[PDB]
Coordinates of C-alpha atoms in Angstrom, one line a residue:
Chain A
X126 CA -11.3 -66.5 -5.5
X127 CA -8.8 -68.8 -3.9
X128 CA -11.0 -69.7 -0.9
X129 CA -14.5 -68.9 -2.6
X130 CA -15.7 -72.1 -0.8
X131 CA -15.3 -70.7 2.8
X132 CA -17.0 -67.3 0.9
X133 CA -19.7 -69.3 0.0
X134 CA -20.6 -71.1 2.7
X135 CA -20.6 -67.8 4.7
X136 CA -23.9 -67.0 6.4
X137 CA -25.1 -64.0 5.2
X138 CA -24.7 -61.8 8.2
X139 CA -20.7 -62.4 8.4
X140 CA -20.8 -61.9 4.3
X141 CA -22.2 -58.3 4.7
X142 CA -18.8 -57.8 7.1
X143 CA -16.7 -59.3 4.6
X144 CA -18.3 -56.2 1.8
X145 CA -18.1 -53.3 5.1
X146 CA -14.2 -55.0 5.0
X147 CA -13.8 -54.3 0.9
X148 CA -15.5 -50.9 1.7
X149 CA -12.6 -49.9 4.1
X150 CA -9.8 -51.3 1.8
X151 CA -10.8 -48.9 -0.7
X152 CA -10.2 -45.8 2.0
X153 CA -7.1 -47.9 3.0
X154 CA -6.1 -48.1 -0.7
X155 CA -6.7 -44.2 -1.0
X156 CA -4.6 -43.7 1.6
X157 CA -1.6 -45.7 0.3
X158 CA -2.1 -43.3 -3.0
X159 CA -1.2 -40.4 -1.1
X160 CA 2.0 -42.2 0.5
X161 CA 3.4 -43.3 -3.1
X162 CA 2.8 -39.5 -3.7
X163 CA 4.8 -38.2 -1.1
X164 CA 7.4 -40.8 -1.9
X165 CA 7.3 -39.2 -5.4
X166 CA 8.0 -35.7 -4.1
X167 CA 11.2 -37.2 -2.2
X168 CA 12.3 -38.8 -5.0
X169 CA 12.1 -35.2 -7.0
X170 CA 13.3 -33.9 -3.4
X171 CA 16.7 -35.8 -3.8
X172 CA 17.1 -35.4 -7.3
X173 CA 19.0 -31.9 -6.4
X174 CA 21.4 -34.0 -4.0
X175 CA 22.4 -36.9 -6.5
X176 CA 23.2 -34.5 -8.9
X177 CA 26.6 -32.7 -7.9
X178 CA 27.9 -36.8 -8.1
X179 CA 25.9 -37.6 -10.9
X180 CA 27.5 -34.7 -12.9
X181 CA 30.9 -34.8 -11.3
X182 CA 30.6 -38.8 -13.0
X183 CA 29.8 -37.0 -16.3
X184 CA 33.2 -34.9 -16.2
X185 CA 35.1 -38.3 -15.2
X186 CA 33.7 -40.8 -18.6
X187 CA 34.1 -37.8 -20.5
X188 CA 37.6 -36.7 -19.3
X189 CA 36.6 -33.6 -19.0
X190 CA 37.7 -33.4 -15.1
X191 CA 41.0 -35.3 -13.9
X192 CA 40.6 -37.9 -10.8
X193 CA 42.1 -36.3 -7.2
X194 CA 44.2 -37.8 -5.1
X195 CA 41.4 -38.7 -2.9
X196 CA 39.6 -40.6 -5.4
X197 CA 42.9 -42.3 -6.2
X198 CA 42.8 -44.2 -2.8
X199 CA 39.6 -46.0 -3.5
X200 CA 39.9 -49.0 -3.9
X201 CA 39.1 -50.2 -7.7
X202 CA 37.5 -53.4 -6.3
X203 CA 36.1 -53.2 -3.0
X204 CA 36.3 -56.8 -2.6
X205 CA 39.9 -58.5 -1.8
X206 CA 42.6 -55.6 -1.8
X207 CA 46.3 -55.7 0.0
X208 CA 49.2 -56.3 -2.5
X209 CA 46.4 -59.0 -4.2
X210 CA 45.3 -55.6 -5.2
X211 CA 48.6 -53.3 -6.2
X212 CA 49.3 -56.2 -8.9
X213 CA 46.0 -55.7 -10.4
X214 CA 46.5 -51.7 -11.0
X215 CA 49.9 -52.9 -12.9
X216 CA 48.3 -54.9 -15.3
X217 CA 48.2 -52.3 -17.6
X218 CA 50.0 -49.2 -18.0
X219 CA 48.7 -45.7 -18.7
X220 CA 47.8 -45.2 -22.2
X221 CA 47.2 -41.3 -23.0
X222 CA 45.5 -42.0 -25.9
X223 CA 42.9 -43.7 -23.9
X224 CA 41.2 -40.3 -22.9
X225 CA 37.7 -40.6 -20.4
X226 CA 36.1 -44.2 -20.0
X227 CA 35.6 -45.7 -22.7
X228 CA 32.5 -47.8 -23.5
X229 CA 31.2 -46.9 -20.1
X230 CA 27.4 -46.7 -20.1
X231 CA 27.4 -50.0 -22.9
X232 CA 28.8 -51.9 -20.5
X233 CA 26.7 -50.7 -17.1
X234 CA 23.9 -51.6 -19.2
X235 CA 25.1 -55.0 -21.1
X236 CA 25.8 -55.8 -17.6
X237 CA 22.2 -56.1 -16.7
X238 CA 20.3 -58.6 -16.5
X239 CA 17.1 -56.9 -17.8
X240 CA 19.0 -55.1 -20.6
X241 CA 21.4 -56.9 -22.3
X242 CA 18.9 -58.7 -23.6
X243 CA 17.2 -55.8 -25.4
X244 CA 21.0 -54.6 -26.4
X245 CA 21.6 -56.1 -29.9
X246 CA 25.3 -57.1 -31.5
X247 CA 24.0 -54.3 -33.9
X248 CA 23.4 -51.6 -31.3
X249 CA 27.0 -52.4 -29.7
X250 CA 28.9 -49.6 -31.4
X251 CA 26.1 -46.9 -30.8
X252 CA 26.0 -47.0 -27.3
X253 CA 29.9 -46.6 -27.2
X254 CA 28.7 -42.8 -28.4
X255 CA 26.5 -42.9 -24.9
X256 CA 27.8 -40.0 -23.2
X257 CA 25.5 -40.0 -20.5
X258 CA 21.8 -41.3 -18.7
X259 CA 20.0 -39.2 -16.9
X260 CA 16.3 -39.7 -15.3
X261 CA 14.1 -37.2 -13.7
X262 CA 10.8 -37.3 -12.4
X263 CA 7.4 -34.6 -12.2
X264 CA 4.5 -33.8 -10.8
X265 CA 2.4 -32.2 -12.7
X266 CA 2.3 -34.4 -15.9
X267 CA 2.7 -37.4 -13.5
X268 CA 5.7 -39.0 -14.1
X269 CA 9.5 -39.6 -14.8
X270 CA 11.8 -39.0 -17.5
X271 CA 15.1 -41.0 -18.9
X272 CA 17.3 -38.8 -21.1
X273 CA 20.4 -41.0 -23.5
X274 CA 23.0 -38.5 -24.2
X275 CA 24.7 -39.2 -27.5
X276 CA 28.0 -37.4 -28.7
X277 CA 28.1 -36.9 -32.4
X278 CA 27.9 -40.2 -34.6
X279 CA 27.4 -41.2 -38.1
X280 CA 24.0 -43.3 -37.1
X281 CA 21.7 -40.4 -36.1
X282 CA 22.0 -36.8 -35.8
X283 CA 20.1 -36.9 -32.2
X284 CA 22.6 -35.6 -28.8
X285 CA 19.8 -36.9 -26.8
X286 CA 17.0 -39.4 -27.1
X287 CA 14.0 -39.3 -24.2
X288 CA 12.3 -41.8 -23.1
X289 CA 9.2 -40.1 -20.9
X290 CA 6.4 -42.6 -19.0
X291 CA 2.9 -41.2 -17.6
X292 CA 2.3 -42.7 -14.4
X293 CA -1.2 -42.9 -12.5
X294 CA -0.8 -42.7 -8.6
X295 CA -4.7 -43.0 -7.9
X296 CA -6.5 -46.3 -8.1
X297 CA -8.2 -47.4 -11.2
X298 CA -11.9 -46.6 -11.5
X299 CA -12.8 -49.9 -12.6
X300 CA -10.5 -51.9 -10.6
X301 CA -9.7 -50.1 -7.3
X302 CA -8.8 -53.4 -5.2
X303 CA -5.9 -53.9 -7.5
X304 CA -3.9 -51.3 -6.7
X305 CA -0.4 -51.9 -5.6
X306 CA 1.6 -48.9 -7.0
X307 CA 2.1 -46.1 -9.4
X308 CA 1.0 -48.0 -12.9
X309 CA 2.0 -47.1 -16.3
X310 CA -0.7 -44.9 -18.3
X311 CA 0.9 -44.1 -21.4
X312 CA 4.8 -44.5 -22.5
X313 CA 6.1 -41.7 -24.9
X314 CA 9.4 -42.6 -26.9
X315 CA 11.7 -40.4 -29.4
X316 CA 11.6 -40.2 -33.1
X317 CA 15.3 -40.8 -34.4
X318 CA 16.8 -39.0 -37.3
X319 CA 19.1 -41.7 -38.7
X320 CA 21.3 -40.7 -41.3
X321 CA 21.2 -43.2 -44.7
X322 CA 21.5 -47.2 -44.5
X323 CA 22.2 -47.5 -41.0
X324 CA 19.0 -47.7 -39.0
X325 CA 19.3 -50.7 -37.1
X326 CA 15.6 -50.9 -36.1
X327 CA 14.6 -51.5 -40.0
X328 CA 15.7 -54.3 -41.4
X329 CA 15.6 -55.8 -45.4
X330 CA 14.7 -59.3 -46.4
X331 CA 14.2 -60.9 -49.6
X332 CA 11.7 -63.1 -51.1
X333 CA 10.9 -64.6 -54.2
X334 CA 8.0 -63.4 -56.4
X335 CA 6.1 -65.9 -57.5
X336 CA 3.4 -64.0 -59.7
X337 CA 3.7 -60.6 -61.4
X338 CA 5.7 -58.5 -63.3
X339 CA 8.8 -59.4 -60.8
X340 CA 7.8 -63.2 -60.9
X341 CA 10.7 -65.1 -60.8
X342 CA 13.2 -62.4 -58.9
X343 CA 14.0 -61.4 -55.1
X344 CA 12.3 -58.1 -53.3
X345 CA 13.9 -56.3 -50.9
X346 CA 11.1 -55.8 -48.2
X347 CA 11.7 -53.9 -45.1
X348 CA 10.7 -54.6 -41.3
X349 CA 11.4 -54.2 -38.0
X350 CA 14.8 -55.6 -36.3
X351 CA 15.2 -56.1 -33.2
X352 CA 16.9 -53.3 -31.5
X353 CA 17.9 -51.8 -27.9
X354 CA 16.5 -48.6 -29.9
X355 CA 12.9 -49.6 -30.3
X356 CA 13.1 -48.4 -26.6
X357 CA 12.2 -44.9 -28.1
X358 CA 9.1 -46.5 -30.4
X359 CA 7.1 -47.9 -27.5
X360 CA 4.2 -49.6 -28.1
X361 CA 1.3 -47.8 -27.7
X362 CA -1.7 -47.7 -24.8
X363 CA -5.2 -45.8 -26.2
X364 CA -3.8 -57.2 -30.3
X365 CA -3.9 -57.2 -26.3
X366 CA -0.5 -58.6 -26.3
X367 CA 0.5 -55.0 -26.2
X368 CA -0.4 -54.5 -22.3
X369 CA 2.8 -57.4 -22.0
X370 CA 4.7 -55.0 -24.0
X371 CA 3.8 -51.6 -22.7
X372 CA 4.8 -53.5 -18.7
X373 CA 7.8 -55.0 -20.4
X374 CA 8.9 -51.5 -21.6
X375 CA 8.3 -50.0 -18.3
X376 CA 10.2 -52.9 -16.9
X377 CA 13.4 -51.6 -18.5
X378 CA 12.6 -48.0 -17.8
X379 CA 12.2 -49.0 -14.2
X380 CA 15.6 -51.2 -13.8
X381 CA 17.4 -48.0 -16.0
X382 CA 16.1 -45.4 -13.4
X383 CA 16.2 -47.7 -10.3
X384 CA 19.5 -49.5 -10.3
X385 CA 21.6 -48.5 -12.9
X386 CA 21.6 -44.8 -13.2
X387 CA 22.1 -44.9 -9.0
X388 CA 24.8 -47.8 -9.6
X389 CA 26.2 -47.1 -12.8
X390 CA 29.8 -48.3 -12.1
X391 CA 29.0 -51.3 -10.0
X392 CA 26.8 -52.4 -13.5
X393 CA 30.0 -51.4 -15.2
X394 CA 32.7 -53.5 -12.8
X395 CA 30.2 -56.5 -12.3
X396 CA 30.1 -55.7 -8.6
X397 CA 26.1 -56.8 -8.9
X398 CA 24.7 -59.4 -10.8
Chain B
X286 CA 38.9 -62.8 -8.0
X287 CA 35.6 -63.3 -9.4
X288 CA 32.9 -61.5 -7.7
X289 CA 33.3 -58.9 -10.5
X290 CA 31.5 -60.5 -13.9
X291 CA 33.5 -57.7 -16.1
X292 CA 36.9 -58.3 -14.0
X293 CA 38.9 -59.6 -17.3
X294 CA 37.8 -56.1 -18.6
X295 CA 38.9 -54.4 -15.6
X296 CA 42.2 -55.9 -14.9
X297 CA 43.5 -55.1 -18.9
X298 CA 42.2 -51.2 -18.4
X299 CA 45.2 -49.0 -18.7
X300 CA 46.0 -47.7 -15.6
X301 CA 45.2 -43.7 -16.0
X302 CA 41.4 -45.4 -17.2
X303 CA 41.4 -47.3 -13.8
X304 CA 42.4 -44.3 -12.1
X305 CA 39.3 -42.8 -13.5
X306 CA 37.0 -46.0 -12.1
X307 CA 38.4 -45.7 -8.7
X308 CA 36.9 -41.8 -8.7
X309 CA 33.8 -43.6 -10.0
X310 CA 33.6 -45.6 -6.8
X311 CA 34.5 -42.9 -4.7
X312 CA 31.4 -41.1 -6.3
X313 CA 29.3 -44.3 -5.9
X314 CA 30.0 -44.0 -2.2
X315 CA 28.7 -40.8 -1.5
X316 CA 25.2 -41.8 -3.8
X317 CA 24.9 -44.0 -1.3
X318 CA 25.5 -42.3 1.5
X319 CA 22.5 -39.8 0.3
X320 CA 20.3 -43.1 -0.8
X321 CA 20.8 -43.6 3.0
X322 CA 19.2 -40.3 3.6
X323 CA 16.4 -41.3 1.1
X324 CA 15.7 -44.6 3.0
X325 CA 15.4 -42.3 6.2
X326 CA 12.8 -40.4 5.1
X327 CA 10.7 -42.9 3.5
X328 CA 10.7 -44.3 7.1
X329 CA 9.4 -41.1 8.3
X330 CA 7.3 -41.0 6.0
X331 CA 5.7 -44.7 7.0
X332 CA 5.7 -43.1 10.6
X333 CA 3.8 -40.3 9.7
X334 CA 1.1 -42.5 7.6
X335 CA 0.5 -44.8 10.4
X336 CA -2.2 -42.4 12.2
X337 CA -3.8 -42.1 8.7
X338 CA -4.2 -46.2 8.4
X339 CA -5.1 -46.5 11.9
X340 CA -8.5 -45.3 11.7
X341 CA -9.3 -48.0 8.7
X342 CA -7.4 -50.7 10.6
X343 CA -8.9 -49.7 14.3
X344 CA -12.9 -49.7 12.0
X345 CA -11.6 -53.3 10.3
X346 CA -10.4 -54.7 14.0
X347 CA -14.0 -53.6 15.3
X348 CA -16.1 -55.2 12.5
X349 CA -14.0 -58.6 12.6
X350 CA -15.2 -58.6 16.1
X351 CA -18.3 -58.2 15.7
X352 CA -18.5 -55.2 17.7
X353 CA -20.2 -52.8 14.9
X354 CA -22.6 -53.5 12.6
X355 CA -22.2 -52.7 8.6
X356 CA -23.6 -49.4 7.0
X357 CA -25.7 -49.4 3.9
X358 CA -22.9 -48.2 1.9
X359 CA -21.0 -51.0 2.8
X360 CA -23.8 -53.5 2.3
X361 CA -23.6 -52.2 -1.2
X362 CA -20.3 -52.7 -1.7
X363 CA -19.3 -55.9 -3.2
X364 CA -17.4 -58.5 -1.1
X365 CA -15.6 -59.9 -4.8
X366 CA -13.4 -57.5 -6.7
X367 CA -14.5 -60.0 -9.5
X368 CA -17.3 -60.9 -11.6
X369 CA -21.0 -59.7 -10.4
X370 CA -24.3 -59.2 -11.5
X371 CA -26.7 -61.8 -11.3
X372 CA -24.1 -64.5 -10.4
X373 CA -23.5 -62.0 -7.6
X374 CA -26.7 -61.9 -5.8
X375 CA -27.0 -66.4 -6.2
X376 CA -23.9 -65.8 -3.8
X377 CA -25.2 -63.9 -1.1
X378 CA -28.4 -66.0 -1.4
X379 CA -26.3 -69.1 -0.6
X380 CA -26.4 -69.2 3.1
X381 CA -28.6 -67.3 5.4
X382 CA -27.7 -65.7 8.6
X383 CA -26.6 -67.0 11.0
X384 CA -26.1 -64.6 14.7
X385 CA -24.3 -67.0 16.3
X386 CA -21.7 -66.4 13.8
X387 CA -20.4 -62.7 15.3
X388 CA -17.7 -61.1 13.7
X389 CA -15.6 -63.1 10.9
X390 CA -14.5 -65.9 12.1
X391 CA -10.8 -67.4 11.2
X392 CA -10.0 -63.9 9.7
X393 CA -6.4 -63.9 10.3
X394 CA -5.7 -67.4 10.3
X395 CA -7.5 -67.6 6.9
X396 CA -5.4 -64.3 5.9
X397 CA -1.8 -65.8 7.0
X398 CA -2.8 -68.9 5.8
X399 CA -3.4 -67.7 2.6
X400 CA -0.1 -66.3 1.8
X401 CA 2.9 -68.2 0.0
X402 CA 5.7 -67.3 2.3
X403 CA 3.5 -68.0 5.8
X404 CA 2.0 -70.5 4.4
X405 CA 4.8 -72.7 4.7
X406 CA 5.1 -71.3 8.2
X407 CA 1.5 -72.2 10.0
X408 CA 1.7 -76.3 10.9
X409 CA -1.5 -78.0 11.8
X410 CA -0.8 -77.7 15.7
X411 CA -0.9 -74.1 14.9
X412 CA -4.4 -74.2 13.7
X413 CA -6.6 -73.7 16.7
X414 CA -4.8 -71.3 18.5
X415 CA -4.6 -68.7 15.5
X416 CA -8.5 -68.9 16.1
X417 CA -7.8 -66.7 19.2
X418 CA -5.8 -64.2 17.1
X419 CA -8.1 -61.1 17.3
X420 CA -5.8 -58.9 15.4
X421 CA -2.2 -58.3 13.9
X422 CA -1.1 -54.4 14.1
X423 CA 2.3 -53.2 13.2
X424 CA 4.2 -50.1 13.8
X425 CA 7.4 -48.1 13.3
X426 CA 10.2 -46.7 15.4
X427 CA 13.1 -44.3 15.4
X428 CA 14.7 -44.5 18.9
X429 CA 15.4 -48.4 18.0
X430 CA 15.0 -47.4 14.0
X431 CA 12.6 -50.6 12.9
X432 CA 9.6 -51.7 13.0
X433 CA 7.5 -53.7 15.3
X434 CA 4.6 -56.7 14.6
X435 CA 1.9 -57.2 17.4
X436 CA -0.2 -60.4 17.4
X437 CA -3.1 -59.9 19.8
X438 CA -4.7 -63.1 20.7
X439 CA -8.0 -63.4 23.3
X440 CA -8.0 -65.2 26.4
X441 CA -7.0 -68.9 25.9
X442 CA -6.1 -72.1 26.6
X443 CA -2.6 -72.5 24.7
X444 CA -1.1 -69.7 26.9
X445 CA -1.8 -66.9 29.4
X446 CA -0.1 -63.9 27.0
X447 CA -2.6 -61.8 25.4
X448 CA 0.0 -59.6 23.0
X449 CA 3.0 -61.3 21.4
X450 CA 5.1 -59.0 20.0
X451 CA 7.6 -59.2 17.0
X452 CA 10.2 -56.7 16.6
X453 CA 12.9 -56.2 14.5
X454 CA 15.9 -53.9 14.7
X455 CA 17.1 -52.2 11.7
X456 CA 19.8 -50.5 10.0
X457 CA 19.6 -47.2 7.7
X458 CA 23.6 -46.7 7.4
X459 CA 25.9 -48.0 5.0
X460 CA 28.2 -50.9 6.2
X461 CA 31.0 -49.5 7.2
X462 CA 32.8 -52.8 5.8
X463 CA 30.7 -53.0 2.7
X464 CA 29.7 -49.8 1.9
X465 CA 29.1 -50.4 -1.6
X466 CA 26.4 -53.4 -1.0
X467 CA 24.2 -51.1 0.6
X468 CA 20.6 -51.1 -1.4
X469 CA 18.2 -50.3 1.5
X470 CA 17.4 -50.8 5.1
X471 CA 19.0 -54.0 6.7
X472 CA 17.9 -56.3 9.6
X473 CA 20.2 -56.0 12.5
X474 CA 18.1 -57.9 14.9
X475 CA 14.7 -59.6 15.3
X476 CA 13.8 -59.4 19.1
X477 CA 10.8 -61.9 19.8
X478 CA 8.8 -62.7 23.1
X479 CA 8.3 -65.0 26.0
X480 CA 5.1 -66.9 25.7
X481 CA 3.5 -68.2 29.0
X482 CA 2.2 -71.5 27.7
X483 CA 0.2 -73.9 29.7
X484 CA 1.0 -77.4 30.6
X485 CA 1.2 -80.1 27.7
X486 CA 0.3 -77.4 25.3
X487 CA 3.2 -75.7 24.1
X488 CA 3.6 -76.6 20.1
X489 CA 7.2 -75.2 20.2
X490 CA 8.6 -78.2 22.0
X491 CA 8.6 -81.8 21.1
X492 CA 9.9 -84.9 22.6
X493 CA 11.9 -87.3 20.2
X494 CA 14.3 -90.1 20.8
X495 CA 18.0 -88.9 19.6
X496 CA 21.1 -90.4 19.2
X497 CA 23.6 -89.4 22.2
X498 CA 26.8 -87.9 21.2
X499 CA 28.5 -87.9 24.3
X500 CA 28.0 -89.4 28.1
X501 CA 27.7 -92.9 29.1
X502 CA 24.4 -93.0 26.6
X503 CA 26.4 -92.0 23.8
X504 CA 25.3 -93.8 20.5
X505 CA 22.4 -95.0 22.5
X506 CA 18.5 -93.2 22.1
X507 CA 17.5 -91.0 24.8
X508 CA 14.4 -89.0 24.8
X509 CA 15.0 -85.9 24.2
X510 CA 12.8 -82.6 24.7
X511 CA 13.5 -80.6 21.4
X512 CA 12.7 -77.6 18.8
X513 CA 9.1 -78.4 16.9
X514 CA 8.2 -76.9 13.6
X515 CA 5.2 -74.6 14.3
X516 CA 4.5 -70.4 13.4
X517 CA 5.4 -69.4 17.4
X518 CA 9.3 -70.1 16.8
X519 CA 8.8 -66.9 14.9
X520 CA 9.0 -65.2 18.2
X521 CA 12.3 -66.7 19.1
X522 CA 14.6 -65.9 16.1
X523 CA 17.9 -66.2 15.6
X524 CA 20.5 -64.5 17.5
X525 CA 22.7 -62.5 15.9
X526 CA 26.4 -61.8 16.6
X527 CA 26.3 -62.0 20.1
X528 CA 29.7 -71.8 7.6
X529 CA 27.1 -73.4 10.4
X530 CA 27.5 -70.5 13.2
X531 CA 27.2 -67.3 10.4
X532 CA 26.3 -68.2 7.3
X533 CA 23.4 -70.4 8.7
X534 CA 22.1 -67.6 11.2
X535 CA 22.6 -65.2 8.9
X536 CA 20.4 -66.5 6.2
X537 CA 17.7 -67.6 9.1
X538 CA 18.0 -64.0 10.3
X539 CA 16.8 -62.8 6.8
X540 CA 14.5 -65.1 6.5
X541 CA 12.9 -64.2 9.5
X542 CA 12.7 -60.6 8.4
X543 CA 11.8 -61.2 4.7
X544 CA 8.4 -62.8 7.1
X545 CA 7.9 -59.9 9.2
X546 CA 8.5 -57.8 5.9
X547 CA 5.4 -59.7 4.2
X548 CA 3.2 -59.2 7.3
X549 CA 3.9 -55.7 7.1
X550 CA 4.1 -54.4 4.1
X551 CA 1.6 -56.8 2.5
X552 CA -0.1 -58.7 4.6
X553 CA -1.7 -56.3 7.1
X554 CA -2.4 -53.2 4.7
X555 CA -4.5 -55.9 2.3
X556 CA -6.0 -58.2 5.1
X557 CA -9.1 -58.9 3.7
X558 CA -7.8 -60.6 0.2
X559 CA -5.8 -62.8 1.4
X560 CA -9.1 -63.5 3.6
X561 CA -11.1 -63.5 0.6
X562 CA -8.1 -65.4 -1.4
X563 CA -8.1 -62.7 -4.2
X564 CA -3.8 -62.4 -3.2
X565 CA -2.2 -65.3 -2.7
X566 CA 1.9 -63.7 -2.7
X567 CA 3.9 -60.6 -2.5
X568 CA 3.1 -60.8 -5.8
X569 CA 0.5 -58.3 -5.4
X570 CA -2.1 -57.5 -8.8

């Protein structure tokens, strides 16, 4: 590519131990398929050990467990801390009212880069009814999962909305050299029972008739918004713009699984940015 | 205190709510405490692949030297992941052979060469002695827990060594100090080697006339003996521990990693294509 004039210029002889090289990067690549694999079973593997923390964070947004005094100790900021830090916790006083953590897994995710831009004024006061996100990955239909707990609401009668991508961990047939990775196959979202007037991923616009029996007045068409939950009506795999989209989906996915779900507070306290 | 983006949120939370965000980073701690564990393994795991590559990497070291000859199969195989058909065989019509040309020669010059970050690293002095580099092997470690890059060069004029080695020190535990930065294994320490170079031939060194600071030259122009841009000051890094003292080591210490990173993980496992130029980057596609 790149250098194709030192490739051509290549006597034939040393050409023939540039293909033997291509040959061998294909059992090289095969290889690196089988690690990615076994990385895959130890992400599954640790699944089991994140979760006593991942669930004991549940209890604590919910309010369903109280802090201990342990926990108290921590330091809120892990950056400066002294007395700088004891006039910071008396900023505000206790509200009992103010029961869990309120607007917890909007914020982690408005705090990311990646995200907030898919995260729409409109789709503010939904994800305050995010109870919980929670990812898991498999085997057999090759793969991970990202489950969005919902507590009840008034926009849709859904308590959780999946999100589930098929991943390929051998190289493509018809382009083994490019291998790099596990790549996306096929992204499966969630239909959403909205209840009346209030899905945010439709969307109603006027326009003048010009001709017909409505010539003269407005319609009310509707189309698609844009909305944090079109996450859960991915495009789909089988205009060509669409393999950008499917990647830009799994881009999301990825930084949801990745770094926030692992780092959820840190997204929520601005610790990384 | 602004290294927290959401701190004007944080500061007006009621205090029984930030009560509830300080268990949150007590949790976080112990996520990563077991994402250290993760990090572990994965490095066990690399060990534990290395015998697998080997074999690929030990046939790829004997072909480049021209010390076996290509099978059928691979004759067959095409030497451009690109287009091919009839445009294919005009290529390999091109030149004829040539057996003075044994092996591939320039393989891993033309495969550092190639890549963005290195690149930027390989000065023209450079040039001719990366001719003698025979191969580049790398390998991983427990006991000092990190990783190790080793340059093999043939016998030579520019110096006597044969290997030049490249090691790097790393660390799988959270900062006892920073727990909560903690995304992955850090460098510690990059360890490089003592080169035996020959007389007027040593790229690292250069003389230049400098402005004296101090002594009965000072303000006058003495000729000076100093530091040369060139690749081989990659095998005397940056000292460690032992705002122009930290934070300029610091980021020259990662920096020096982030290299040794791309000739790892990148470089080495996909040799050929950066030969062949189909990769140009980490960007890998």
């Amino acid at each position: 590519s790149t250098n194709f004039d030192m490739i051509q210029a290549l006597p034939l002889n040393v050409k023939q131990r540039v293909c033997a090289l291509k040959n061998l990067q294909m059992k090289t690549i095969q290889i690196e398929s089988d690690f990615y694999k076994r990385v895959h079973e130890l992400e599954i593997e640790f699944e089991g050990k994140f979760k006593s923390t991942f669930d004991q964070r549940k209890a604590i947004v919910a309010g369903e467990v109280e802090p201990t005094k342990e926990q108290i100790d921590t330091p809120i900021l892990e950056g400066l801390e002294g007395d700088q830090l004891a006039e910071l916790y008396k900023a505000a006083e206790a509200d009992p009212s103010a029961k869990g953590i309120k607007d917890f897994w909007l914020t982690a995710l408005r705090t990311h880069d990646l995200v907030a831009e898919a995260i729409e004024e409109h789709d503010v006061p939904i994800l305050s009814y995010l109870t919980d996100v929670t990812t898991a990955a498999s085997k057999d239909p090759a793969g991970f999962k990202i489950e969005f707990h919902f507590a009840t609401n008034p926009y849709f009668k859904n308590q959780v909305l999946t999100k589930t991508y098929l991943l390929g961990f051998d190289p493509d047939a018809e382009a083994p050299l490019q291998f790099d990775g596990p790549h996306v196959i096929r992204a499966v979202g969630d239909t959403i029972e909205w209840e009346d007037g209030k899905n945010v991923t439709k969307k109603a616009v006027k326009k003048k008739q010009k001709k017909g029996a409505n010539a003269g007045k407005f319609l009310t068409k509707t189309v698609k918004a844009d909305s944090f939950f079109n996450f859960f009506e991915p495009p789909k795999s089988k205009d060509e713009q669409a393999e950008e989209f499917l990647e830009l989906d799994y881009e999301m996915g990825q930084a949801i699984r990745d770094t926030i779900i692992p780092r959820a507070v840190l997204f929520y306290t601005g610790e990384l940015q």
